[PDB]
């Protein structure tokens with residue numbers, strides 16, 4: 001089937017067999033192999049032998065170090081320029097711009113960056129051709145969700161970074177058994193490359209191969225393809241997490257009729273013997289991980305974890321909104337994780353965990369800001385910049401966006417249904433973000449329409465997750481602003497459509513705010529474990545208790561309704577104060593944001609709620 005041996009890469013397979021691969025799967029491999037020209041091809045099987053042999057290569061290449069104080073834990077230091085998820089260099093490739101983002105009025109579209117196919121082909125042919133020269137191309141077959149379960153998707157990611165192969169084994173279900181399940185079914189085509197072929201023309205920092213100048217993350221929903229280049233950190237290289245489970249999954253969810261959201265899933269049990277499942281949509285670095293692994297301070301309550309990031313939901317035959325966690329591990333922020341704040345996380349990241357950009361102690365341990373843990377006498381600390389660090393300098397020993405990669409099965413409070421194929425019925429949805437002043441601690445929506453409005457009106461201060469800096473209160477609807485896969489206007493309609501399904505059991509909607517400060521800069525709520533006091537009020541409302549009070553913005557707990565025993569000193573007046581001067585400006589910014597960003601694709605019900613809220617606030 002060829003004139004010269006220039007298309008048959010059989011003599012470059014160090015593991016596996018191109019013959020054992022399905023038809024369309026093999027064509028996808030040899031196609032990019034001819035374009036990227038890898039030195040070798042490594043078809044993954046996910047076995048322990050492969051994972052152990054994969055670690056030795058990175059260690060012998062100066063990429064990762066071994067943390068001797070813990071059982072099979074490794075540290076990795078990356079290039080200082082590749083530490084976050086570049087939102088500015090992320091594009092969605094569709095034929096019509098209206099499919100990706102709503103055509104704005106005058107202003108620019110914050111709800112995504114659209115790029116044409118012609119402009120994408122010009123940049124595509126200017127990067128990949130020859131990027132894997134002298135490297136190994138790993139074929140990674142993973143599965144988002146339990147194998148054989150409903151709404152379970154399979155993908156094939158080709159990459160040249162063993163740091164990606166090791167992480168993909170932790171975050172997804174990858175191995176040979178995934179190929180047997182796929183057979184002749186569809187699969188998302190993923191392609192990743194660091195962009196540093198051999199010989200190296202640019203010296204690498206910390207042996208971290210990257211190309212910041214040419215970093216590009218593109219999505220093609222029409223082709224079911226995902227193409228990333230240049231980067232190699234979290235959501236940029238782990239295509240199954242952000243690019244697949246959210247952006248592309250949202251497009252499929254709109255076509256097929258389910259939901260793909262950036263929410264956590266946690267079940268809570270009360271002293272009376274009842275258990276309910278909740279979901280929370282918080283922006284990055286806003287409190288999703290600490291909430292799903294919470295150690296409550298109330299006796300008789302038990303909180304178990306199902307997920308901390310991705311959530312795929314869909315109605316069932318009985319009218320329930322069941323959800324599953326398509327992921328297999330955890331990829332949460334490191335700084336601030338201590339025994340007092342998130343004790344469940346400390347128990348999980350002590351074995352089979354890969355750390356990144358965190359400080360290392362002399363005795364082989366880990367260290368980061370907010371760890372709140374004394375060291376033994378004579379122990380030194382090495383910052384993430386590979387330098388000797390002391391608490392007297394200004395350089396932090398660990399990067400703000402430094403992460404840990406740990407399997408989900410090792411969590412002590414993992415819910416015994418995190419891999420069930422049918423999912424868990426969700427009875428509540430929680431919105432919120434980092435709002436320093438104005439937003440009360442917690443309130444409840446008035447209806448399903450007003451609830452959707454609450455999610456669309458989410459705002460929060462810029463944190464340390466993307467490339468945003470400063471204390472700016474920007475908009476972030478549904479905590480999905482950086483992960484919208486199609487038109488946001490149609491997105492708001494997809495949620496409002498859930499109120500039309502027959503025998504629909506719609507869940508309640510709440511808005512919280514743990515970060516409301518006072519006039520001095522001190523948090524009015526301790527948070528973390530004490531957040532269970534707020535979750536208790538949400539549990540009773542679901543059962544139908546009469547503990548709510550009507551306000552111009554929603555339902556707030558009545559007096560003597562929150563279990564504040566043991567505290568008593570919390571300033572309740574300022575923690576639930578609704579100022580008329582504040583909410584008259586808040587709606588002003590909400591009115592200007594919706595008209596400029598959604599424009600003609602804004603549903604009438606979202607506008608009817610905007611007028612309803614404005615009217616009620618003017619009557620104060």
Ligand SMILES: Nc1nc2c(ncn2[C@@H]2O[C@H](COP(=O)(O)OP(=O)(O)O)[C@@H](O)[C@H]2O)c(=O)[nH]1
Nearest residue numbers: 284285286287288289290333335336514527528
């Ligand atoms: N004040 C307060 N801070 C919190 C709470 N939960 C988390 N945080 C802080 O948020 C930071 C990271 O939050 P995290 O849960 O990892 O965010 P996410 O996983 O991206 O959703 C930590 O350093 C904590 O200090 C809370 O309930 N109250």
Ligand SMILES: [Mn+2]
Nearest residue numbers: 262283284309
């Ligand atoms: Mn996230």
Ligand SMILES: [Mn+2]
Nearest residue numbers: 289308331332
């Ligand atoms: Mn997280």
Ligand SMILES: [Mn+2]
Nearest residue numbers: 496497499500
């Ligand atoms: Mn309707």
